[PDB]
Amino acid sequence: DITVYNGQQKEAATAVAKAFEQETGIKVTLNSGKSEQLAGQLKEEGDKTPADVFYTEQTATFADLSEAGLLAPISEQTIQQTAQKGVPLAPKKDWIALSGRSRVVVYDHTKLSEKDMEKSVLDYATPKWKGKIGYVSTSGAFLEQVVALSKMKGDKVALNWLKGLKENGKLYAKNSVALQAVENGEVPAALINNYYWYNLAKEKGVENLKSRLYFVRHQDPGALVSYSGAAVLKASKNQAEAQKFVDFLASKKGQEALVAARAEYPLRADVVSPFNLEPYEKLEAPVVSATTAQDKEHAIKLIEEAGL
Numbered sequence: 001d002i003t004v005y006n007g008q009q010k011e012a013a014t015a016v017a018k019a020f021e022q023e024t025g026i027k028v029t030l031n032s033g034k035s036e037q038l039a040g041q042l043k044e045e046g047d048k049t050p051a052d053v054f055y056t057e058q059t060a061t062f063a064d065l066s067e068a069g070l071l072a073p074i075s076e077q078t079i080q081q082t083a084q085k086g087v088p089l090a091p092k093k094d095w096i097a098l099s100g101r102s103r104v105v106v107y108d109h110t111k112l113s114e115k116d117m118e119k120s121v122l123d124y125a126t127p128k129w130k131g132k133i134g135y136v137s138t139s140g141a142f143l144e145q146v147v148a149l150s151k152m153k154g155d156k157v158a159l160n161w162l163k164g165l166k167e168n169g170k171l172y173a174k175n176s177v178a179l180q181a182v183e184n185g186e187v188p189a190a191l192i193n194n195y196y197w198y199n200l201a202k203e204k205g206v207e208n209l210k211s212r213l214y215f216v217r218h219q220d221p222g223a224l225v226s227y228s229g230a231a232v233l234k235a236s237k238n239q240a241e242a243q244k245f246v247d248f249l250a251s252k253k254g255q256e257a258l259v260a261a262r263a264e265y266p267l268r269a270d271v272v273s274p275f276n277l278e279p280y281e282k283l284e285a286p287v288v289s290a291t292t293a294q295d296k297e298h299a300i301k302l303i304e305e306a307g308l
Ligand SMILES: O=C(O)CN(CCN(CC(=O)O)CC(=O)O)CC(=O)O
Pocket: 009, 057, 139, 140, 141, 142, 174, 175, 193
């Protein structure tokens, strides 16, 4: 049996842990928390950690741990199972990306069509979209988007985008609220993440929704994907089962379990999501370095400078 420090949404983690317990008979104990906190705890615990695996919604949180020498290598063969072009790879082969969440534009298809959409996320923050674009400045993925803009286009472009949203956008407290605002006709489009919409569509039926999704693609900053993943702790005294679990997560079966539980894009190329997601490769996500604490601090400063 293994102990998994879990920064991923509890529902997803519970699902893969059960499919694992069923393929193998090995019990998983999930210890859930925020990935940044869990990473801090793993670093502090060091060679005395009881964690076998760290399962996260954000592979960026592995960087501090890898840099501290706290992660074990994963089999090359396992890493390759999800190594689609675009997918972040651990330079030390000491963690693996497993699935992704995407930025997206949700829009009310009774008011806008795909031909009205902007091909760059930068262009939603402009006067064409005055009063017409929702955004969620407190959201984690919004912050990731700002970080990506700063990295890809520079801080001035990122700040200008934020000021453009301040002037032209409608602020919503949460992605779910923004999605409902589009559905209810309050705003014709909003910047959210994919999984809110796919969840709503799965539950209610797309035939009963006014909203649709527009993906900018072509490695635009707005095609940003945030990657979930897993790592084995170097200090684990149960390497064999820890590795078995990570191997399972990258297996067809483990990926099938994840995608049934949460509308993340699987990174295997032979798994289709019951949420009816497009294949990961079609997203054309940009390649962006991992978000650091420093990156986040800088992005928060830009949000404040923009008046948000
Ligand atoms: O709790 C929230 O406010 C939204 N989140 C978690 C935050 N997000 C990113 C975002 O909504 O911007 C998912 C994640 O970071 O893993 C719950 C969910 O996505 O199910």
